[PDB]
Amino acid sequence: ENTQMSEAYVERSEECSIDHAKAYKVHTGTVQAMVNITYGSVSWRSADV
Amino acid sequence: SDHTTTCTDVKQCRAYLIDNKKWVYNSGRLPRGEGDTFKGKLHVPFVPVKAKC
């Protein structure tokens, strides 16, 4: 004539802040590049476009 | 203190012990206490860290 309770419960692990699978949804976005420009008698100048 | 019990045999009476000066981590292999047991926290020493192997 006795009773043992013994409940259980699932929670996030402590290593979930260092490796996890992020789940993203992708739409169309911007396109960038980088160019190297020289013309005539000047040196190469580069910029992000 | 004391309380000499007026019964005969030692096999027909259970005994317990209430120590509350210190506190223990709530294991799954220990019996739960009486009422509201508080949520007081201890830090975990060796946490994961991202290093170079």
From Swiss-Prot, chain B:
Compartment(s): Virion membrane; Host cell membrane
Post-translational modification comment from the UniProt entry: Palmitoylated via thioester bonds. These palmitoylations may induce disruption of the C-terminus transmembrane. This would result in the reorientation of E2 C-terminus from lumenal to cytoplasmic side. N-glycosylated.
Membrane-topology descriptor: Single-pass type I membrane protein
Signal peptide range in chain numbering: none
Highest taxon listed in the record's lineage: Viruses
Function: Plays a role in viral attachment to target host cell, by binding to the cell receptor. Synthesized as a p62 precursor which is processed by furin at the cell membrane just before virion budding, giving rise to E2-E1 heterodimer. The p62-E1 heterodimer is stable, whereas E2-E1 is unstable and dissociate at low pH. p62 is processed at the last step, presumably to avoid E1 fusion activation before its final export to cell surface.
Self-association state and partner proteins as the record states: Processing of the precursor of protein E3/E2 into E2 and E3 results in a heterodimer of the spike glycoproteins E2 and E1. Spike at virion surface are constituted of three E2-E1 heterodimers. Interacts with 6K protein.
Annotated protein name in UniProt: Spike glycoprotein E2
Origin species: Eastern equine encephalitis virus (strain Florida 91-469)
